[PDB]
Amino acid sequence: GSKTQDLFRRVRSILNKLTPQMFQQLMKQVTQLAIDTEERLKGVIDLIFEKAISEPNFSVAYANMCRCLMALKVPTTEKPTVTVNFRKLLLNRCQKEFEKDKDDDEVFEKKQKEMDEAATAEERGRLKEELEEARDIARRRSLGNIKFIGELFKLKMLTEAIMHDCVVKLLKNHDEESLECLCRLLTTIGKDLDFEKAKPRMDQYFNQMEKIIKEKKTSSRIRFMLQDVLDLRGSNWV
RNA sequence: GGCUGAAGGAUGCCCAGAAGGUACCCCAUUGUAUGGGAUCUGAUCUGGGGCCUCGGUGCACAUGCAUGUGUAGUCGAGGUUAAAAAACGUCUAGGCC
Ligand SMILES: [Mg+2]
Ligand SMILES: [Mg+2]
Ligand SMILES: [Mg+2]
């Protein structure tokens, strides 16, 4: 049983040491890891996903690390005649994280009543600090998940269609968190998405947020980041 | 009681179909929302796909270095079916001790 925990230790060590420049030298270590059980694979994917969405800066490296294990079949423990590819498991974690928003507010609502139940000023302030801290923890996760999906797109483990139905989903929910994520995703995938096969559809995305830019109904910071994204588009994504 | 491995399943690729999505467009309510349609898709499921024909090279054989024959998971060259695939970070049926 110590073998699974030792594999987790080595995977976490590699993730901590992983950096863009020294990438290649650690990849041999990644290919030499004995991942042969659905539990080990799920745990390694859990570690990679958590690190990649909790720390967006180095997510690029982690994305490329995932490319080195795009083909790592393992037999499902329940029915040992079935197999699960690493890609199927890593993408399921990504898609599940992407659509938690539908339920996300719910848990805050489940805590929102407590805001009323904290009678005294000390309790009210402590409850308010905890709820906004939770809101920060969630918005930091969603942004990490979006940048990780965008980084996996540049390595072709995804396709243009998932980005085109992720951008439109973020944009249809005109709430602040979604528009911040839309800014991050377009900023990280604009050059690899601005092609002539997607020229018509893209020509509406920005146009839509242009109205947002002109409406000034949302918070300023959102407009500010949208202006940055539109200006980066105007300069050929560089 | 231990070693090994079938293009038999599974995985990957390709094709068909389905759930789902679909900014823009159109139709209805009509409210910029919902529902339906049209493309475009399809992170997900259900199936199907391991064809021919000809050369080069290599190999083996059989005849007199040459010719004929068969073909190496061979390189190409073309056809055919909607589809001509990772000889596969996998499980088995076995096979051996
Ligand atoms: Mg449909
Ligand atoms: Mg199939
Ligand atoms: Mg089949």
Author numbering: 754 to 991
What does the paper say about this structure?
Within the EMCV IRES, the region G680-C787, designated as J-K-St in this study, is responsible for the specific capture of the eIF4GHEAT1. We previously determined the structure of this J-K-St region by solution NMR spectroscopy. It is composed of two stem-loops (J and K domains) bifurcating from a base stem (St domain).
Further local refinement with a mask on J-K-St/eIF4GHEAT1 yielded the focused cryo-EM map of the region at a resolution of 3.7 Å. All of these bases, except for A724, interact mainly with the positively charged patch on eIF4GHEAT1 including side chain atoms of Arg 840, Lys841, Lys922, Lys925, and Arg954, whereas the nucleobase of A724 is extruded from the stem to deeply interact with the negatively charged cleft including sidechain atoms of Asp918. In the St domain, G690, A691, U692, G693, C776, G777, U778, and C779 also interact with eIF4GHEAT1 from the minor groove side. All of these residues, except for G777, interact mainly with the positively charged patch on the eIF4GHEAT1 including sidechain atoms of Lys826 and Asn838, whereas the nucleobase of G777 is extruded from the stem to interact with another negatively charged cleft including the mainchain carboxy atoms of Thr784, Leu786, and Ala824, which differs from that contacted by the J domain. Since the cavity on the St domain formed by extrusion of G777 was filled by a lysine residue, Lys826, of eIF4GHEAT1, the flipping-out of G777 is important not only for its direct interaction with eIF4GHEAT1, but also for the formation of the binding pocket for this basic residue. In the J-K-St structure in complex with eIF4GHEAT1/eIF4A, the ASL domain does not form the short stem-loop, and the upper stem of the St domain, which includes the eIF4GHEAT1-binding site, exhibits large base-pairing rearrangements within the ASL domain bases; i.e., G686-A781, A687-U780, G689-C779, G690-U778, A691-C776, U692-A774, and G683-A773. G777 is flipped out to interact with the cleft of eIF4GHEAT1.
